Amino acid sequence: GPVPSRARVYTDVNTHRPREYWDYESHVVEWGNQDDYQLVRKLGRGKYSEVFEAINITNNEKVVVKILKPVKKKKIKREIKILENLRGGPNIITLADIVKDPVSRTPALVFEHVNNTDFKQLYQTLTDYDIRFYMYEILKALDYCHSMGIMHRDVKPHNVMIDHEHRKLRLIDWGLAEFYHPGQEYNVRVASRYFKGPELLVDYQMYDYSLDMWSLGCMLASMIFRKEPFFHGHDNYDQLVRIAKVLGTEDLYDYIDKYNIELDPRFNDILGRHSRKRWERFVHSENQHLVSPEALDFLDKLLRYDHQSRLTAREAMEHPYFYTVVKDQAR
Numbered sequence: 001g002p003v004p005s006r007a008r009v010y011t012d013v014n015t016h017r018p019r020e021y022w023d024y025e026s027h028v029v030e031w032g033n034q035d036d037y038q039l040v041r042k043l044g045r046g047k048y049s050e051v052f053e054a055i056n057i058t059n060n061e062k063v064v065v066k067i068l069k070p071v072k073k074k075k076i077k078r079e080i081k082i083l084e085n086l087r088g089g090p091n092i093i094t095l096a097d098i099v100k101d102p103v104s105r106t107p108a109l110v111f112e113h114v115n116n117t118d119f120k121q122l123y124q125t126l127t128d129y130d131i132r133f134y135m136y137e138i139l140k141a142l143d144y145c146h147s148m149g150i151m152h153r154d155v156k157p158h159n160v161m162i163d164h165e166h167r168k169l170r171l172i173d174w175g176l177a178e179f180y181h182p183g184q185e186y187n188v189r190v191a192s193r194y195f196k197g198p199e200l201l202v203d204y205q206m207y208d209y210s211l212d213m214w215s216l217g218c219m220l221a222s223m224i225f226r227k228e229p230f231f232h233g234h235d236n237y238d239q240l241v242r243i244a245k246v247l248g249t250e251d252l253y254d255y256i257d258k259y260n261i262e263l264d265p266r267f268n269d270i271l272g273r274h275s276r277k278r279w280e281r282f283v284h285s286e287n288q289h290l291v292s293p294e295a296l297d298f299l300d301k302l303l304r305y306d307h308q309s310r311l312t313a314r315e316a317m318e319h320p321y322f323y324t325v326v327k328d329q330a331r
């Protein structure tokens with residue numbers, strides 16, 4: 001059976017909190033008054049929610065309403081508790097209220113007003129500096145939630161809002177997030193395929209905050225190399241193959257050995273043998289303006305098989321890739 005693993009940081013943060021902090025099954029939702037909010041316009045739709053701009057009529061505040069599609073009550077409680085625990089954190093969406101929808105009977109989360117810039121208009125105009133800046137802003141949200149004992153587990157472009165006009169950013173969709181407890185075995189069937197860590201793909205359940213750092217690395221690769229998604233698997237198996245064709249099979253098998261992970265002998269044959277590639281082979285005339293030695297060094301230190309060897313959020317924030325942004329922020 002597999003060798004156990006622990007977060008290198010924020011290991012015991014939840015153990016030191018009152019049980020109610022993380023024991024979301026005990027949480028009692030006190031519903032607000034639905035009549036306080038009038039929907040104004042639809043902003044977007046997901047498979048799990050509909051998002052609207054609304055107005056709080058009690059006081060004339062602009063608000064955003066996320067009307068949840070039916071999900072298991074446990075997972076709704078989890079997301080609410082996490083949002084409440086993280087309220088006020090840097091670049092975390094701020095949950096103002098919780099109301100039941102009259103029509104669908106389903107829950108509606110009410111947030112402090114947030115703006116999204118149509119990314120497509122930005123994508124073609126995003127500088128090397130901009131990427132460093134926004135990556136730093138994401139890292140502030142991740143360091144915060146990790147420090148608060150919470151893994152996002154679904155880091156991806158769709159879960160990152162920017163308001164480019166005001167240089168503002170928000171990490172959204174906390175629906176897959178979970179509390180970190182040392183020893184706990186988590187469901188590996190989380191995150192979008194392109195951003196799943198190797199730990200998920202090889203079925204190592206005793207994972208931690210460092211999952212988010214892999215996903216972040218996948219995002220960084222897609223941005224600097226202009227290749228979205230960067231690791232484009234067509235299935236969960238091929239996802240790991242795409243990774244292995246870049247990082248190499250030697251380090252993959254070293255990881256599996258270190259943690260005594262049992263992998264299907266079939267998987268071993270379809271994985272094959274691949275050299276570790278230099279990152280330079282993915283630089284081309286279109287993307288080279290986004291790529292620096294510092295960007296590649298940083299990327300290298302996120303995208304490791306061994307979850308324990310990846311940078312933490314706080315370490316990442318100290319990395320040379322961010323030096324001029326930090327200096328400039330401290331204007």
Ligand SMILES: Cc1cnc2c(S(=O)(=O)N3CCC(CCNCc4ccc(-c5ccccc5)c(Cl)c4)CC3)cccc2c1
Pocket residue numbers: 043044045051064066093111114115116119130131132134135138157158159160161162172173219223
């Ligand atoms: C709570 C809530 C829920 N939804 C809301 C909606 S929505 O549902 O319509 N909405 C969902 C979110 C989606 C995100 C677009 N992300 C683009 C992006 C951003 C940053 C990066 C990036 C990272 C690192 C370095 C450089 C760039 C990249 Cl690569 C891409 C837009 C659409 C609108 C308004 C307010 C809402 C409020």
